[PDB]
């Protein structure tokens, strides 16, 4: 099918530059324009610019001087580069494609790239188990989880048993601690009688720091 | 640029009810308006193009109408998976602009939380920090109080809460409260208590444990 896959999230120092790569499949860059949209707390959805089939570009008025979009047709890659980032440039950046080659109704989106503009350093999380017990069991259902603590910047991805466990999973929104590092828990409820038979593993991936940890979570 | 104004900011409806989203433009834009759904942690999904035209793969319950400055996205019978934010986009005038969005919340019956408490791991204690987590699972409505107590001393300002977005399947919320201490303080005390108040409970529910 039609897909747009963007590069991983990351930290960009203030006044430095942002680079994202949008790799497409299921169509050709020679036939479609690729658009760039971002989504910020301050301004919500905001169209930035586009590179057309033939290599022409338009940039939204506020970005004409700090935005360049380039591409490699044979590699099916589109490259977004923005200069002199301030902290309010912290946003999710999307690449998108319209239904028709000249239009703007965005039917296909990339997964988005969360870009944090901050002076701080990348730091991977520590992963601690939230062990099931009697204090977390009622009516034959146990709760268990993983505490994903002290990482920067957002986001971190969490899954269970490599993707096979999705039901009853709650991964809480991260909260910023006084230290300026983030923290979250991910929990899941399972039948308590499966604790002796099934393994439970939270898979933690913090892309900005290239930290992947699998934490096995056991009754104590 | 065209300013798109979406009203209201929040809609709250019950399943099966019809619901309408409003988008107003700062000047006429004909029928050059598109609508999007954004789900929790998702990218925008195209619902309607040019005011009223349907999109492949979009359920029939979605429709749009309007022309000029006044537009409407409708869901004739809301489902729980419709829980999302909704955005309009105009493209009559360059550059294409988006509205600020409307949030769709779903009502349901009161559901009391299940409350679980988790002591800090031995692993975490080696690091010299202690996190005590209190979990409130699958409840409605969103309002809840969590009160921490250590050996009967009321805790204040040393916990943080996180609440999930509304569940797409059962319309409930879940909440975590995390009490943070040093290893040293944690070892100085015995009884760690999490007291929960919610409309679905006829009295406060307390989950606690004794260190060791």
């Amino acid at each position: 099918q039609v897909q747009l896959k963007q590069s991983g999230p990351g930290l960009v120092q203030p006044s430095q530059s942002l680079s994202i790569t949008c790799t497409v499949s299921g169509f050709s860059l020679t036939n479609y324009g690729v658009h760039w949209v971002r989504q910020s707390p301050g301004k919500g959805l905001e169209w930035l610019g586009v590179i057309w089939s033939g290599g022409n570009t338009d940039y939204n008025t506020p970005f004409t001087s700090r935005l360049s979009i380039n591409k490699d047709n044979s590699k099916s890659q589109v490259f977004f580069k923005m200069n002199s980032l301030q902290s309010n440039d912290t946003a999710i950046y999307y690449c998108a494609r319209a239904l028709t080659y000249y239009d703007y109704e965005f039917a296909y989106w990339g997964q988005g790239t969360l870009v944090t503009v901050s002076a701080a350093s990348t730091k991977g999380p520590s992963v601690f188990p939230l062990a099931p017990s009697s204090k977390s069991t009622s009516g034959g259902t146990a709760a268990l989880g993983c505490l994903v603590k002290d990482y920067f910047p957002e986001p971190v991805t969490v899954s269970w048993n490599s993707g096979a466990l999705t039901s009853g999973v709650h991964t809480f929104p991260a909260v910023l601690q006084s230290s300026g590092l983030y923290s979250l828990s991910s929990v899941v409820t399972v039948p308590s009688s499966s604790l002796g038979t099934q393994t439970y593993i939270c898979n933690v991936n913090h892309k900005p720091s290239n930290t992947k940890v699998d934490k096995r979570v056991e009754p104590k | 640029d065209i300013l798109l104004t979406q009203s209201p900011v929040i809609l709250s409806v019950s399943p099966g009810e019809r619901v309408s989203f409003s988008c107003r433009a700062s000047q006429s834009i004909g029928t050059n308006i598109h609508w999007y759904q954004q789900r929790t942690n998702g990218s925008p999904r195209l619902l309607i193009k040019y005011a009223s035209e349907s999109i492949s793969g979009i359920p029939s319950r979605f429709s749009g109408s309007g022309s000029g400055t006044d537009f409407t996205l409708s869901i004739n019978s809301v489902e729980s998976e419709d829980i999302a934010d909704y955005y309009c986009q105009q493209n009559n005038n360059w550059p294409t602009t988006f509205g600020a969005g409307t949030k769709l919340e779903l009502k349901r019956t009161v559901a009391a939380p299940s409350v679980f408490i988790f002591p800090p791991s031995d692993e975490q204690l080696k690091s010299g920090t202690a996190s005590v987590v209190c979990l409130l699972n699958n409840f409605y409505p969103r309002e809840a109080k969590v009160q921490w107590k250590v050996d009967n001393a009321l805790q204040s300002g040393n916990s943080q809460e996180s609440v999930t977005e509304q569940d797409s399947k059962d319309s409930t919320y879940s909440l975590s409260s995390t009490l943070t201490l040093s290893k040293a303080d944690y070892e100085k005390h015995k009884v760690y208590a999490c007291e929960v108040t919610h409309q679905g409970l006829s009295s406060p529910v307390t989950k606690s444990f004794n260190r060791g």
Binding site: - | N41, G101, E165
Partner: peptide, 10 residues
């Protein structure tokens, strides 16, 4: 107001 952690209006 849009929240980057959840990708939802808060």
């Amino acid at each position: 107001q849009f929240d980057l952690s959840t990708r939802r209006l808060k």
